[PDB]
């Protein structure tokens, strides 16, 4: 059996420029920093951040975190606050929950979403 | 508070193709199946696939899954013995512990790394 997810690892053009990004969002909390890179633990997450040009077109490819319902507007405030790339939200299935769509400084695809694949279905 | 991880969305090409390979290897259960989509459960962690011609070129971004020291061997075997693409496996830091990358068919990189992030440390 394979255990659970090991890290995620994302390419960003400038460091610095998406740490704060998500230690500010997301509140990564650091764990540390030859080649430029730094871990964080968002969510009890293992996310690994590593500096270079690596970020090809965006994609419907993303990742979503789970937030609860009454986060969602304030969330929505947080992220129009860091002018960070906001699409507007559309109304989904009301019994599918809501989400929200946004994008890091490089093609990353982010995706907070609220209400359980366990209601889902 | 961010909860967890709500779930990776992947875009593939062929549907049916991508299932194959992630029931056989990452030992995925189907939760079901407008639009044509599937969704699935991998170590405890709600994936998403869709099917779409989204798949922009590799780079280094890409989810690593934790599995154990013994399994590297069998593991690296059945990735083989599907015919994926495999890269041939580097030691790291005897103490970082070992990994192995490999491609579905759709310019997606996966990891399966074996040691936690607290003795990575």
Same mark, same amino acid.
């Given at each position: 059996? $394979?255990? /659970?997810?090991? !890290?995620? #690892?994302?390419? +960003? ?6 740490? =704060? ?6 509140? =990564? *909390? ?9 871990? &964080? @633990?968002?969510? /009890? ?6 500096? %270079? ?5 965006? #994609?419907?490819? !993303?990742?979503?975190?789970? $937030? ?10 947080? $992220?129009? =606050?860091? %002018? +960070? ?7 989904? +299935?009301? %019994? *599918? %929950?809501?989400? $929200?769509?946004?994008?890091? &400084?490089?093609? !990353?695809?982010?995706?907070? !979403? =609220? /209400?359980? @694949?366990?209601?889902?279905?």
């Amino acid at each position: 059996m $394979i255990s /659970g997810l090991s !890290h995620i #690892t994302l390419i +960003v053009k400038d460091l610095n420029k998406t740490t =704060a990004f998500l230690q500010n969002i997301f509140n =990564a *909390e650091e764990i540390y920093s030859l080649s430029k890179e730094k871990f &964080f @633990l968002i969510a /009890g997450l293992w996310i690994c951040i590593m500096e %270079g040009d690596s970020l090809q077109e965006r #994609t419907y490819n !993303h990742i979503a975190f789970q $937030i609860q319902s009454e986060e969602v507007d304030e969330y929505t405030e947080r $992220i129009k =606050a860091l %002018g +960070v790339e906001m699409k507007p939200e559309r109304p989904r +299935v009301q %019994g *599918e %929950g809501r989400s $929200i769509y946004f994008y890091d &400084f490089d093609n !990353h695809l982010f995706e907070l !979403h =609220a /209400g359980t @694949l366990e209601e889902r279905l």
